[PDB]
Amino acid sequence: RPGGDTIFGKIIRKEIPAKIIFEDDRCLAFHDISPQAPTHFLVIPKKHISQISVAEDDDESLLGHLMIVGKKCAADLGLNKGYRMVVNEGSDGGQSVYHVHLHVLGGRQMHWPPG
């Protein structure tokens, strides 16, 4: 099945519900079920890539598309004071779902360091 069978692949295929913000042929933006900020959503490719460390050179445009969609959705959600985008890789990065995803967090002051 296209997108794989991680939770995110299931969400892509509408097999598990999610609160969807934006969708096109390349990606899907939807709210995180365990938000860490007043607004916290995810932007994921529909193509299954397990983690950023194995992304191909030819995935550049797709990965950049995640960030463009991320910043457009943030504007559409009224995050006028800004926001933080996060990609987690592997264990030290805190990755728990092995389908590439961009976190977008806003609606509060984010602190430094970023975890």
Active site residue 48: no
Please state whether 26 falls in left (phi above 0), alpha (psi between -120 and 50) or beta.
Answer: alpha
30-69 footprint of ligand KBJ as x/- string (CB under 6 A)? xxxxx-----------------------------------
Give the number of residues written for the chain: 115
95, amino acid identity: Q
- Cα–Cα separations (whole angstroms), residue 66 to 43, 113, 115: 6, 23, 22
Choosing from 73, 95, 97, 98, the residue that interacts with a second copy (CB under 8 A) is 95
Catalytic residues: 101
| Residues binding a second copy (CB under 8 A) | 36-37, 52-53, 55, 57, 59-65, 67-68, 70-71, 74-75, 79, 81-95, 103, 105-115
